[PDB]
Each structure stands twice: as structure tokens, then as C-alpha cells.
């Protein structure tokens with residue numbers, strides 16, 4: 001392990017953050033060491049921030065110009081100058097805390113220059129502030145009230161709902177209420193949004209919404225708008241798939257089957273149309289090694305930064321340098337970026353560690369590793385998940401110390417491919433025995449078996465239905481897990497093919513119900 005003095009000589013990065021966090025959790029950072037430390041942290045968010053702040057709280061930060069404004073309370077705000085009054089009224093909790101006479105007084109004060117404040121002040125003098133704001137069609141006010149409390153729910157007329165998409169908050173609002181199945185009056189109201197007024201993710205979610213109310217023509221129009229506006233080919237393909245499922249225009253399915261993006265929708269479309277499986281690149285570097293240490297986390301952070309900041313030309317230089325067997329994962333990483341994501345790379349590094357598992361199991365391991373890390377042995381996430389299989393430290397230690405009782409086990413063993421694959425196999429055994437489907441296993445790998453069990457216990461998820469199991473896959477309540485399952489499923493199909501153990505993606509979908 002590295003001392004704080006030695007870590008401080010390394011460039012700021014997630015690897016440095018991780019090792020600082022490890023010192024903090026073992027209580028090895030003194031109050032004196034902690035003084036300058038926030039400048040040594042690459043991403044000052046989450047657990048590392050909570051741990052540091054148990055040693056040195058931050059008071060910060062009130063803009064010096066407005067300090068005096070925060071000396072007032074609800075009881076004294078009428079004594080404050082007008083600038084101070086308007087600053088404090090940015091907070092709806094503050095407004096809620098005022099007495100109603102003062103809300104009336106302030107509403108008058110601000111009616112000319114800040115009618116937004118007037119509307120909220122008067123709204124909070126009623127028993128339903130959302131109703132008052134909705135009657136005023138105050139869009140900024142609507143989103144402030146929603147951020148204040150998700151519990152307000154009301155029917156919204158055609159005029160109002162068509163104004164909501166213009167606000168930056170709309171996409172997260174729509175996603176949240178549709179995926180969580182909350183705010184049913186808002187959800188029902190959003191059936192009347194004109195597809196002309198939305199695009200991209202918003203349009204797509206409104207399609208999903210329309211499907212849940214069996215408004216299939218409205219759903220098609222939303223999905224079509226999404227297909228026309230999405231920036232990424234994978235997302236476009238997802239929208240075209242829905243267009244096809246709803247109306248069965250064979251030109252939509254043909255377009256999907258010819259996609260340059262390899263995803264579950266384009267794979268399924270190819271299978272339905274007897275189109276050949278997409279071309280998978282074959283990487284076999286003849287040079288065996290270079291000088292790069294694939295077990296050094298700091299060396300990876302450095303080369304990753306270079307790769308991500310490299311111009312079209314510099315990528316070609318790095319490609320040649322890492323064109324070795326030993327650095328195959330880095331090579332494929334560079335090529336994927338270098339070819340602007342048009343070629344399909346599905347490598348199988350450190351294969352000797354999995355070759356004795358059955359092919360179906362190999363494919364699942366490889367599918368997870370590809371998405372988790374692109375097979376970078378010293379990969380570290382923002383939550384400090386570790387290695388190719390991106391184990392969280394808690395689970396790594398449980399398996400390594402309690403279950404397998406590996407002598408001198410340290411969580412950093414997860415950076416060794418033999419360990420990552422072995423632990424991955426071990427955990428995948430647990431999950432698969434309970435869940436069976438590789439899609440459900442993927443959801444549980446990323447999101448936990450608890451979340452997955454709760455989702456599968458619901459009456460409305462992964463049961464029989466007109467648009468199942470595809471609709472259920474759009475309604476997986478955690479965005480990261482929803483996305484992850486789709487990507488790992490695609491990878492799984494590809495690796496099964498590469499290992500001469502092909503399965504039809506249609507069989508996967510049948511077994512989800």
C-alpha cells in the first residue's frame with residue numbers, strides 16, 4: 001500500500017482517489033494530512049467526500065455578497081432589503097415556512113418585477129400550490145414545485161402539457177414518472193403532447209407512456225419522432241424496433257436489420273429477416289509484449305487520459321505501440337475509438353482462465369466483462385468497483401476472505417484477471433441458479449438480486465402481454481440497470497456465436513415471459 005505522501009506525487013485520478021479512500025476507511029489520514037487534501041481529489045463526490053468531512057467539516061459556501069441575506073429567518077424577512085428578500089424566495093421550503101400575511105405582502109412587492117415569485121407566494125397561501133401554478137400555466141413554477149415535492153399530482157390540459165417540454169427539467173420529469181409509475185394524472189396528461197414538441201429521449205419515453213395506456217397510434221408517432229432525432233444509432237434502432245412492433249411496416253424492420261450498430265434490436269431484426277450475423281473483427285497481434293505494466297492502476301489512468309484526448313492522428317500512434325498480446329485489451333480499446341465505433345471488437349483476453357467452463361458460461365462472463373471494463377485489468381469506477389469484472393470491495397472481500405478464504409487476500413486482487421474471472425464465475429453461479437435468464441442475471445449483477453427479485457415479483461413486469469417482454473425491458477426502474485441489461489444481452493449473443501455455441505435471440509426473449 002502507498003502512503004499519503006507518495007499518493008500526493010501521483011496525478012489526480014480515480015486510482016489516486018481510490019487509494020486515498022482506502023487510507024480514510026482504515027483511519028490512516030490524520031487531521032493534519034487532511035488539510036490540503038481536497039486539491040488532491042479528482043472527483044470530490046460521494047463516500048470520499050463524506051469520509052473527508054468527518055475529519056474536516058466544510059462550512060462552505062455562501063457567496064460573500066449575499067451573506068447578510070442568510071442572517072434573516074421567516075420571522076424577520078420583512079426587515080430585509082429587497083435584494084435579500086428575492087434571494088431567500090428562491091427556496092420553496094422558505095416560502096412554505098412563511099406566514100400567509102407575509103406571503104400576501106411579498107406577493108404585492110414582487111408582482112411587477114418578479115411575477116414568478118408572486119405566483120409561488122400566492123400558490124402557497126392555498127391548500128394546493130400545484131393547482132394554482134397549473135391554472136397560471138407558470139412553467140418555471142411547475143418544475144420548482146415538482147422538485148420541491150413529487151407528491152403533487154393533477155390533470156394538465158393540452159395547452160399546458162405542450163409547454164412543459166421546452167424546460168430543461170422535462171426529460172428527467174417524464175423519465176422519472178413513467179419508469180417509476182408515479183403521478184398518474186401527470187402521466188395520463190402527457191398522452192396529449194404533440195410529437196412535434198418533443199425529441200430524443202423525451203419522445204421515446206412518451207412512446208413508452210402511450211403504450212402503457214394502449215394508445216398505439218400515439219406511441220408510434222412518438223417513437224418515430226425519437227428515431228428521427230436520436231443522436232446515437234443504438235437508440236435510433238431501439239425506437240425503430242418499436243415502430244416495427246406497433247405497425248409492422250417491413251421497411252422499418254429492414255432498416256433495423258441493416259443497422260451499423262450491434263445491439264439487441266438490430267440482432268433480432270437480422271434473425272427475423274434471415275440476414276447474416278454481423279462481422280466481428282479479429283485481433284491477433286504477433287508482437288508478444290511491450291514495457292507497459294497491465295497491473296499498475298496509475299499507468300492505466302494516465303494512458304486512458306491520453307487515449308481520450310488523442311486526435312485522429314495520435315490514436316494511430318498509440319494503436320501501434322499497444323499492438324501486442326500482453327496489451328490486447330488496451331489495443332482493442334484504442335481501435336474501437338480510432339474507428340469511430342464502426343467496427344465490432346469482441347476480444348477474449350486471459351482466456352486460459354475460462355476455457356474449462358462450458359461455452360454458455362464463458363459467454364456470460366465475457367459479456368459482463370466487456371461492458372464492465374472493456375477487459376482493462378485495473379479498471380476503477382466512480383464508485384471504486386475494481387478490475388475486469390468490476391467488483392464492489394464489500395462483495396470482493398466477502399468472497400475472497402469469508403467464502404474462498406484466500407491467504408493474504410486483499411481487494412486489489414480483483415485487478416488480477418485470474419481472480420476477476422474466478423470471482424465472476426462464482427457470483428454468476430449464485431445469480432443464475434436463482435434467476436436463470438442471462439438478462440435477469442445481468443440486471444442482478446449490476447443492480448443486485450434484491451432489486452431484481454422485487455421487479456420480478458410485480459404483476460406488471462415480465463409477464464405475458466402484447467408487447468412483452470420488450471415493454472418490461474423499457475420499464476426496468478433503474479436507468480443504469482435498464483441500459484446495462486440490453487448491452488450485456490447483445491454481448492452474450494455475440495460471444496455465444498463466436499464460441500460456436502449460437503443461440504437465437506428469439507429463444508432468449510421467449511424465456512423472459
Ligand SMILES: CC(=O)N[C@H]1[C@H](OCC2CCCCC2)O[C@H](CO)[C@@H](O)[C@@H]1O
Pocket residue numbers: 370371372373374379380381382385390446480484
Ligand atoms: C470502469 C467503469 O467505470 N466501469 C463501469 C461501466 O462503465 C462503462 C464502460 C464501457 C466500456 C469502457 C469502460 C467503461 O459501466 C457499468 C454499468 O453499465 C459499471 O457497472 C462499471 O463499473
